[PDB]
Amino acid sequence: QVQLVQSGAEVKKPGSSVKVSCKASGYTFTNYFMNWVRQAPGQGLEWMGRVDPEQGRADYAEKFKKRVTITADKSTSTAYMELSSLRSEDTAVYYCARRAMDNYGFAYWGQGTLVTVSSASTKGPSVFPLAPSSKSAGGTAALGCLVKDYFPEPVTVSWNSGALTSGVHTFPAVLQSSGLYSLSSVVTVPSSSLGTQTYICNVNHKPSNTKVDKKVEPKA
Amino acid sequence: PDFQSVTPKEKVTITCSANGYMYWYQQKPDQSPKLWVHGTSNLASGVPSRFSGSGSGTDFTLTINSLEAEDAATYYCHHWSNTQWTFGGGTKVEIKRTVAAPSVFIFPPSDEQLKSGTASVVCLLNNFYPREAKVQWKVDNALQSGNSQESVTEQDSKDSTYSLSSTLTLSKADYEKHKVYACEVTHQGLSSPVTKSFNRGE
């Protein structure tokens, strides 16, 4: 029952600060360092630093000796990490971590806090059909939806309100030069179904309250 | 981040070079790391005994005997040096299977999109293995460079394949200047490249 519970995701503009929290329970808070670890999207783990909650003292890794302030509040069993003067390359998942009882390895991790740093503003997607080819069948056709020009992540895509799951691939979003994301979702279906069966991609972008139901049909 | 393909039931050894005690972690996507090995050779709690840690000199290893599907993950080493912790670069272990060719599809831009001045042309490569594939866009038989972006799925849980999308982005004006749009795909499972094409407006 050692538990480490972090604060929620933050979308930030360059120049801003963010202070991430890590609430500890199930052990004596002052007995252990609280570590912080960074993981940029699709990249490795990096040790940032740590705080001694008994005396308040912090240590910082060489790479994190600027713009990082790590603290602890004994009375609420909460550790914090403040990141100042944020930059797009600060985009990462940040973890708090405590060592094992009987060794110095990091046995206990928080769930992570996603910090996204971008100059982009909230923006809902446009949804366009990837219509099934007229040359289909073989026997299998592909179709899909292009979900273009949104911020921030994520979008959800379902097919036929969740009834169609077989053969669905929803790709990772790509960041465009504009600073907006784009994503494709595709499904393969029987060619024989195309004249009969309705295919709808159900797209939700909660940050902009955008909900789109796009029917995808053979082009005439 | 190194990439290693392993056939189920085969053995892999990951090396981490460094200058006391080495630690190792397993991490899967959208999860926190799990402590895996501590004190160079001691398994962490709940870790299958088919994993083993070792070290000698400056060379530290994590061996997976008789790999199982659930061992597909990224692994990291971790050590104390001087006045800080250092994590090594990850090693991502994937499942090796028989070569499977992609099924290739091309999609023209929608009329809806074109009415606002951009054309996205999409090429889908579906359910292939291994992950390495080459997509070449051609527009009226001129090879394109610098106007496409691609995305790849994680390995499928059932068939251990990948899928890939490539999107070619043109202005409407540029799209309307040309007739033939073609995606040429090369892959180990394709004896010669596969081309899918359409004529604008057909």
Partner: peptide, 9 residues
């Protein structure tokens, strides 16, 4: 502190 664990500081 130049050690890997608080109990050594």
């Amino acid at each position: 502190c130049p050690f890997p664990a608080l109990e050594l500081c």
